[PDB]
Amino acid sequence: TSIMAVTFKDGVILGADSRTTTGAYIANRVTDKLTRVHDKIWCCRSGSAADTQAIADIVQYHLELYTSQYGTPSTETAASVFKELCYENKDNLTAGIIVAGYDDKNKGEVYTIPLGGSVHKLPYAIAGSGSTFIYGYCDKNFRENMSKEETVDFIKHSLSQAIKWDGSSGGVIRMVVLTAAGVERLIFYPDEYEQL
Amino acid sequence: TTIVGVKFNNGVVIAADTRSTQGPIVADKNCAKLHRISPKIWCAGAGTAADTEAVTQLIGSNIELHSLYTSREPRVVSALQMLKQHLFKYQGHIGAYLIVAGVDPTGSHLFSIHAHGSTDVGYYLSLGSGSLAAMAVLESHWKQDLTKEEAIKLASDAIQAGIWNDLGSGSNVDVCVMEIGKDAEYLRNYLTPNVREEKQKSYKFPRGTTAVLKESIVNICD
Amino acid sequence: AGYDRHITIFSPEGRLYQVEYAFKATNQTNINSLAVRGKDCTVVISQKKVPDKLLDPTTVSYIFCISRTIGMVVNGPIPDARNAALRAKAEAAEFRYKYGYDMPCDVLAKRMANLSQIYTQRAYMRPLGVILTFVSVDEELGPSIYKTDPAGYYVGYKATATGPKQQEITTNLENHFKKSKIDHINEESWEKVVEFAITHMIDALGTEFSKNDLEVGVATKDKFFTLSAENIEERLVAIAEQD
Amino acid sequence: MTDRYSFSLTTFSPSGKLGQIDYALTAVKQGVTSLGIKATNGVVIATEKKSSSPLAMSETLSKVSLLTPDIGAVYSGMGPDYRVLVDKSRKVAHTSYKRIYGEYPPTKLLVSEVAKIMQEATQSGGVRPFGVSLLIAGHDEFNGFSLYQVDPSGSYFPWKATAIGKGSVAAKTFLEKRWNDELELEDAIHIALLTLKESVEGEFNGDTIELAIIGDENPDLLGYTGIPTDKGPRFRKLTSQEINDRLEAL
Amino acid sequence: GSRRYDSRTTIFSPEGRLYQVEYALESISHAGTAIGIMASDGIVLAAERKVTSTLLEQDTSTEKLYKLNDKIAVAVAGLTADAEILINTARIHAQNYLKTYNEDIPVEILVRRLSDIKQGYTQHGGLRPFGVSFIYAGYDDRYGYQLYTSNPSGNYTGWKAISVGANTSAAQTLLQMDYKDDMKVDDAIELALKTLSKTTDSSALTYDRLEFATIRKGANDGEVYQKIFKPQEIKDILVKTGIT
Amino acid sequence: GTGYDLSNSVFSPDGRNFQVEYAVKAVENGTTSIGIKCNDGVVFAVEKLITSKLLVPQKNVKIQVVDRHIGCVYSGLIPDGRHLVNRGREEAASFKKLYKTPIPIPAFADRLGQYVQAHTLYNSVRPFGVSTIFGGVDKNGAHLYMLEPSGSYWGYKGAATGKGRQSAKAELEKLVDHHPEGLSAREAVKQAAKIIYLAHEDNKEKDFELEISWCSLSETNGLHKFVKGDLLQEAIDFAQKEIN
Amino acid sequence: FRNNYDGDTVTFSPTGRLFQVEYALEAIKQGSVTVGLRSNTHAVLVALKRNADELSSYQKKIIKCDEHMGLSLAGLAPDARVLSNYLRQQCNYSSLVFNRKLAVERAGHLLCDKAQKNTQSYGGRPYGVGLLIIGYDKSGAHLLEFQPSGNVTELYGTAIGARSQGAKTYLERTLDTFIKIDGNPDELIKAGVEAISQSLRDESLTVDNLSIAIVGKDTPFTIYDGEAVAKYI
Amino acid sequence: SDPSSINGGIVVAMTGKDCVAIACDLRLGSQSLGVSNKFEKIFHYGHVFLGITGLATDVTTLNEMFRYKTNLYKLKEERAIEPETFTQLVSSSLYERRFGPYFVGPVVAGINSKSGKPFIAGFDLIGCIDEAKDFIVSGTASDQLFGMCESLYEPNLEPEDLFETISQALLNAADRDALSGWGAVVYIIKKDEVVKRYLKMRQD
């Protein structure tokens, strides 16, 4: 698994591979790891598929009930609900979740939640088994307030290297763009990103 | 076990083998692995057979009650959500690996559920001990926009691959076709390529071969 | 013996007085509301009355956004209205989590009516003195109006009205559908369906409205929303350029 | 908070009468007339759809409900009390039977389960009895066709033909004249429409009348093909058109 | 609070009586008459059906005579729904005993347990008592043929011949007049039919208004057999006894 | 008949809850308290009836803080008001624990509203004998609310409850008409002092103490703070000047 | 009127009164008189103990809650035991968990909230005792008056019980005098003895009749009885 | 260690022409030590027969449980239970103890009273239904029984011929198992009559 979320000039873009493995076998090569919890709040899932799917479903339930009573929640609020489930059930969960959402006032925000259940607000975050191989690359190539074109290229080049070295990662590169304009789905095929 | 699921242009088809085993010993040579959750939502089981049977019947019972409460046709997403939340609750101890398919007012669906609660969505799926043999055929012959007849042929070829190449699978091929506009057709023993040849000798014993000590008539009527 | 009118037990006549008095509490607000179905939309109009000058008009509301798709207008006291609103929102979120799809308008109506039935049978829970009208564009049934009462009774409507002057609005709508022969308002845009509902509100009640006198809720495909004072003002200008 | 009504709300009076049951039966008598007739090859249950408003859609309110694919029910009295009993009857058919024996309960046992729920509403603390009487019609392999009447007390008795509600006294007398042990299903439906006409004041058509039958298996209503043992539900609700066709031969 | 509406079902009267028990017995005194008679070679259970119509299905009907065990049966007088609650628990207790000891439950133990449940609603709970009176007909290898009766108070007694329900005073006088210790079952069947026919509030005693059951140890078997009489079997015995 | 006013959850023939209306009488008997919504905050003020010279001045604080941005003031049964604030403090802490952000004022208003409404549903509980004026600054502007014993609450430009609510509401209505652009936080503190002094004529027999609190975006950083020292005396002098 | 609405505490009257609370307040006026008063350094409780017979003991009125806090009772003694025991636990909780001496103001808030819970729920009765809590915390000396209604008020001086108005009128007049008695415990006690004597009518305060307690700047809460109060008579 | 190998024993069921047969051994043991030669493993409730293998304490318990349940069934339904219905009853009862199972291998045999159709069914310890048309085997010599039945069995055997088939399948399978044998009993079940026969076999 190789997942990342990067904030930029117009908002935030989430990126992920499509490989879920049971050992050396690829059970699904077209997996969608970019999960919606709210209209303009999305998450990246890593670790146990059963754990991350159950957590994301509970958060989506909480934010829907939040919207019915108090209106549109903030990205920090959505990260807090994720954190509350991850921290309180830390002994039984294996979940690495990056929360990324767009606000009109706060622009783009990224919150990473590692295994322990802590919250970390960052300009960009990388997680998963394949992220270890791109720590050096992402730190040297990341700039703040990049354009949509630049950010897509940054994530596309980073995840391509993460897929190249990590066996647990592979398939297609999926992207979700979060701006004031709306929500955009992007997909990049092996024949494109492998030769970057 | 070997079970598959293939989506076509106007619906979804699921297929299975008919071999039930107790370790290396075949218990049932012709068992039904294609179960029914609701009239138009069918399920294929893999792993612990008692777990797959009971989890299908429990959700199937609750789906029927939900259908009568809402006055609506059962949805595949409902069966999927109720199965995954039940399986996640037991931390994977209920060893039920299922391929769930069906048609509803929203369209045709195909999902796969694992014992721990994780779910997947695709156009072609396979589970069981012959999952890899079946997937190999699916990855070689699958194309987008298949016809009903092409989907049945592809799913049947995938099960055959599991029958011939996997030891945990054999005997017959069971198929269930679910089209959007029509009733679901369950094809029990769609193919029978494993008929046991006529025995070389009849082993009918002559009457009086077995030694008997005592004989009595059992009372059944109260 | 005379406590049959105090708790929810049967009277010698086979009646339940506490349920009957709960019906009488629904008209305490002196507010009239109507619901109509369009070609692909559902609209609710409700009277907005702000007597005290010290009140914030933006906080005075009897129309609630239950979910993304479902909206609810209430006839009765506001404390009992918000009690039913919070519960309906909780039931809507739970249904989606458990069954994977958005709760239909008629299903939520049945659920709230079943809860009202419990207060009719069990002694310790008093009935809520409110009438709830649920509106949405269902993904299977289309435009829908479903109304629940303190008795636990619920049914679907082509169009409905609730309040002290309910009968005047009801007969006004009845006569229109006898004339049009159809069970809905044959109009493409929701704006004109809102215009229809306001026009027939004026004709039945015999009273003119300003932008602050009305409260409008519109339900469309995959969304329910409420109109602002300026959105109603635009709707009131259009009906004025006809009479 | 907390239910402090732990005592019975229905108690024995000096005369030996259970007041709340008697008053619940009074509420049934005020309700719209519903009837049931058992034929040789089926059972029919019918009622009037008393529309509270012409703006209200009568289709969205079903007074006749399916309990199991072979068992149906109709009522007279309080609508809301019936709806919750149907939900409980459908669930108890699964929890107390189907999840144990892999098959649907026989008519007599499901009726016995419904009667138990209604009995508890008479004795348990802080509740009133159900203000409804039910007519449950069904079929099972070993008993054939049967019809039962369940009262607010929880008492149930089998019927060849009966009616409950407003003009139940006048309807039962008419049913006694027309019923015989050689009636076919179509004959029973014909008598049902004749008996219900006397109770109906206003319009008498397929839109104002609700009728359902327990007869032959319906393979077209099963939803699937392949299993020979599964032949479809015996419960079938007649459409507005199916009623109107039989009203012309009245 | 809720104290206002409390009827207080479990309180003593100034005379030392239990209001709800007394009123529940008053309720049963209007229900159909049930008679049990013990003979030397068996027990006879007879019951009169309260309220009958022409369209009432009798073949599938069972309101007063219930089977608890293969050796024990009951006659019901009072609320039919309240009876079935107690009848179900009695069937469970009988099976619990059989699972524990691998023997059929002695008649008295089953009667006492049901009577203790009836007693419970008399002392605690704040709930109304069961408006039901039972007549227990049963057999065990200790006392042989046994006939018991239990009422809402939770009190049970043994009998040679007993009647519960309507017109008990009239029925008990008729039974005490014609009963002898050396009676046969066929004589006891006749006595039960004669006593009911004389205490009937209706015009004539017909088969469609009767429920009949006998518990006999068949001489050509050696085991106890229960026989709940069918509508035709009641119709036959009604003619033979001289009632027609 | 009668007796509909004895139990809490009971509806009267005219669809009224008398026990709730009886709780309103306890509020009307209580001390007068007000709330003024200004251009970027809210100002709370309360009368403090000095019973005797033995009462230590500036000690018996009536106005209470919920979280760090909400201020609460109530009229009637003081212990009932404290119970409601305790619930609100738990309710605010529960919101912040799960959602990180401090609870919005309209969100907090419903939480108290649902809790007070709950005490009108059962006969085992008594309705609150307090009308609570509360509010503060959140994500989008300032809010002012007044909660009734029935559970009913609304948003207010100016709120008043207690002994001299009529005199206060009259003075609050004068401000809304003369200031359509919006009163300032500095002016609202001075004006709140005047309204309390003018509404004190309904209780002019006893001497009183003035207590003011405010929560403004520019003045107190959106945090609830008590008016103390020079600003308090400045407000007292402004009121004592315009009382004559 | 009153008879229909005084059955339980859960019921309001048409005028908006709670009669079961008001009846509980009547239990205080039946009880023996006790006086509380303070300065800027010390706080004193002077309590008149009541005997049943001349052979009976004079029942104790003052209870120690902590080394810096205590209270005097008027009304039902077992109700005072429950409330003082609760206050003992709250003072103990603050010292064990926070290493902090519980504020006298906060102690009054806790007694207010506990008494309130008995006035809103069915089945419960209001406490039938009035309490006068004295204490020396980080903000100096304090005196509080507790009422069964839940109302707690901070005061310079006060008296509760039978004929307590006589002592209360005295303290309201002597206000400017006893507030300045700083650094002298003996003069503050004598001011309380002069206060409690204003409520006397039946007898004169004797040796085994008088009960005095004091807490202050360098004085832990100590109760004086019998021989120790002889120099104040 | 294995609760299915402490006591030993085997059960086999076979279908014929309008008839079913169920057979079991009589051995009750404690590891290597033989305890009893009278422990019958086949029970009946009405016309439905049930053979149970595995842990003997559970064999006795389940028999007492199903006697308990079929008796209450007969009182409510007013009829005897059918083999198909009883099969589902066993299945649901065993799964009720999913995470604390009875260490058993139940076998249902009988003929439907209404249709006259022969019926046999098998279960694992947690209630999975094995519904075969030919034969059902269970016990410590299940592998031996599978080999015997697969070879000797032929469809539509007459009651007299089916007896010879099931008896020889049981006897030769038990002789290859150390924990099985010590006498045997065969039931021949027909629509009208049921014959019980004790077999003469090795006692080692």
Ligand SMILES: *[C@@H](CS(C)(=O)=O)[C@H](Cc1ccc(CN)cc1)NC(=O)[C@H](CC(C)C)NC(=O)[C@H](CC(C)C)NC(=O)[C@H](Cc1ccccc1)N=[N+]=[N-]
């Ligand atoms: C194929 C699954 S696989 C693991 O990929 O080979 C079949 C699936 C199947 C599904 C539904 C039906 C219809 N009822 C039949 C078959 N699975 C099996 O054959 C399993 C394989 C296991 C997981 C190794 N076998 C069984 O379930 C058998 C059932 C027989 C008696 C019909 N039972 C078992 O093996 C039990 C496992 C177990 C052991 C201890 C505790 C709980 C369970 N053992 N036994 N007996």
